[PDB]
Design an enzyme around this catalytic site. Structure first.
Site, short mmCIF file in Angstrom:
data_model
loop_
_atom_site.label_atom_id
_atom_site.label_comp_id
_atom_site.label_asym_id
_atom_site.label_seq_id
_atom_site.Cartn_x
_atom_site.Cartn_y
_atom_site.Cartn_z
N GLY A 1 3.18 6.20 10.33
CA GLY A 1 4.54 5.98 9.88
C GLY A 1 5.17 4.68 10.32
O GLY A 1 6.36 4.45 10.01
N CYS B 1 4.00 1.59 9.49
CA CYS B 1 3.77 0.47 8.58
C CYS B 1 5.11 -0.06 8.10
O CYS B 1 6.06 0.69 7.92
CB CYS B 1 2.90 0.86 7.38
SG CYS B 1 1.26 1.54 7.80
N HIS C 1 0.80 -1.22 0.00
CA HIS C 1 0.00 0.00 0.00
C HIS C 1 0.84 1.27 0.00
O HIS C 1 0.27 2.36 -0.15
CB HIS C 1 -1.03 0.00 1.15
CG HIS C 1 -0.46 0.16 2.54
ND1 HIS C 1 0.22 1.28 2.96
CD2 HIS C 1 -0.61 -0.61 3.65
CE1 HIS C 1 0.53 1.17 4.25
NE2 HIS C 1 0.04 0.02 4.69
O1 LIG Z 1 -1.81 2.39 6.80
C1 LIG Z 1 -3.11 2.54 6.34
C2 LIG Z 1 -3.18 2.67 4.81
C3 LIG Z 1 -2.55 3.68 4.12
C4 LIG Z 1 -2.66 3.76 2.74
F1 LIG Z 1 -2.05 4.74 2.01
C5 LIG Z 1 -3.42 2.83 2.06
C6 LIG Z 1 -4.08 1.79 2.78
C7 LIG Z 1 -3.97 1.70 4.10
O2 LIG Z 1 -4.59 0.69 4.82
C8 LIG Z 1 -5.05 -0.39 4.06
O3 LIG Z 1 -5.78 0.05 2.91
C9 LIG Z 1 -4.92 0.76 2.00
#
Ligand SMILES: OCc1cc(F)cc2c1OCOC2
Ligand SMILES: [Cl-]
Ligand code: NA
Lengths: 304, 301
Positions: free
Chosen positions: B143, B145, B41
């Site tokens: 931040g 992830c 993602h």
């Molecule tokens: O960290 C949450 C997140 C950020 C992002 F840019 C995109 C997604 C996200 O969560 C799962 O769904 C897609």
């Protein structure tokens, strides 16, 4: 979101842990520059421990009596001396993994990370607080002596604890890295006991603030109080007195959440007087006192 | 003596943490040999949160759209591929600090250490368990992830978790290092919610054995239970079923203490019924379920 008891990354300290053997005793040492630091009681037999004269015990040893192992490599001891209750073993090689570091002595109520070690090998890391009675509630087995405690701030590792012994109640006692014991303890097999402990008030407040930040608000109330009034309550429930310094230290958290410190103290007063009535706070049925105000800020911000 | 939530020493994982940037998004990556693993993602824009088409988003990127920073060093990306929900960025430098490692997908109830990181640099280390509802109860800010969970057995790091997202109840969901999510979750920002959570019964029993090992017997009783009557009672407190596997797994702790598994089960039933009446067990006022039988043996005498 979330709140967890959290230790500093231990990498920088793992690279300093060595094995130190004297006679039949193996424990851990801390290798920084060209000195290995370890508890002076490594030179004792069991009969020695009963009433040791460390200076005389040390005079009889030679450098080759101290076997020091860094991983799979032997280090060569070229000197030995004592500073308080720690042995300093000068080796012929400086540790190439020596981090930026300081030796600092912490205050009761301050927290730190413990890297538990056995035979020079790091086995686990956990977060401890120096209790008001100068013990720590650690987790140690035989062979853990010489494991160290530390904080980190901007790479600089601040070493604050070396483990020396376990007390009959299962809590732990040790020195700073200059060999000075925390608390009224001595490195000998004599009768010793932890004194009655108290609860670290400022840390409980900090954890209540961490709770509010994380959405746990049921203990907030309309009331406020004063230091003198609250401190009368704290004494009754074996809580440490709360000082004006503590209110200042909690300052940030107080304005970030709109609960003034003395507003929170009224919540804590009520919690002390009535219990939690079946409810929990950050998943705990006890009031937690091993998070400092800084701990709460660092975790509820991003500091690395 | 003592008993603490203990994490593994984090240094072997610290030497693998890097920062991955794509567009305006920065998160963490895991650098092993010449591959950087991170959540796919990272390539979503603000429009792509609800229904991203990752194949369509990825085919539009070239290697130089991915910035990878290890400490102060830029790594050169020389290939990219997607495996399930993780991106694998091929870089031109192998990580000289790569430990012995493996990737293992864990089961609910298993524990592991989390190295929380922000912008490629480690912040703190703590211990988690995979809940029965396949979420973990972590501490993750914006931040984080790409932070990873792991165990270390001897000198081998078994990577078992990559952080991807926080669910609305404040708990966390992620993947194994093959990019397969734990539980029914997807990397989309559509309404999803974890199943009702339950207590990990075999872990509470193990922690009760830890308490006996460390010298505390106040909660035992003179009774026993059949396995099925125990389960009938324990479901009524939202405890997970205890299986014969779990009974087998607890054998060694039973031998060390002399307390048969189903007798420890009878003590648990009474504790659920009575509470602790102002006492504590290994310093806790609640029954604790994030120590496995393996954890207890490795920490205790
Ligand atoms: O960290 C949450 C997140 C950020 C992002 F840019 C995109 C997604 C996200 O969560 C799962 O769904 C897609
Ligand atoms: Cl597993
Ligand atoms: Na109030």
């Amino acid at each position: 979101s979330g709140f967890r008891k959290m230790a500093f990354p231990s990498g920088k300290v793992e690279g300093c842990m060595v094995q130190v053997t004297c006679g039949t005793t193996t424990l851990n040492g801390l290798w920084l520059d060209d000195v290995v630091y370890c508890p002076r009681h490594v030179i004792c037999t069991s009969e020695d421990m009963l009433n040791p004269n460390y200076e005389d015990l040390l005079i009889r040893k030679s450098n080759h009596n101290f076997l020091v192992q860094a991983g799979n490599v032997q280090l060569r001891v070229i000197g030995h001396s004592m500073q308080n209750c720690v042995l300093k073993l000068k080796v012929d090689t400086a540790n190439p993994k020596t981090p930026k570091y300081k030796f600092v002595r912490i205050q009761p109520g301050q927290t730190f990370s413990v890297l538990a070690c056995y035979n020079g090998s790091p086995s686990g890391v956990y977060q401890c607080a120096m209790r008001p009675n100068f013990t720590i509630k650690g987790s140690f087995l035989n062979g853990s002596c010489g494991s160290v405690g530390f904080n980190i701030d901007y790479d600089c590792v601040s070493f604050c604890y070396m483990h020396h012994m376990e007390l009959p109640t299962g809590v732990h006692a040790g020195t700073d890295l200059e060999g000075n014991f925390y608390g009224p303890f001595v490195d000998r097999q004599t009768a010793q006991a932890a004194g009655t402990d108290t609860t670290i008030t400022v840390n409980v407040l900090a954890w209540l603030y961490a709770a509010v930040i994380n959405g746990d608000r049921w203990f907030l109330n309309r009331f406020t109080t004063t230091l003198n009034d609250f401190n009368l309550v704290a004494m009754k429930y074996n809580y440490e007195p709360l000082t004006q310094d503590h209110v200042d230290i909690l300052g940030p958290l107080s304005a970030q959440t709109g609960i003034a410190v003395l507003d929170m103290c009224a919540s804590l007063k009520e919690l002390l007087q009535n219990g939690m009535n079946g409810r929990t706070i950050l998943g705990s049925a006890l009031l937690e006192d091993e998070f400092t105000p800084f701990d709460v800020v660092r975790q509820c911000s991003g500091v690395t």
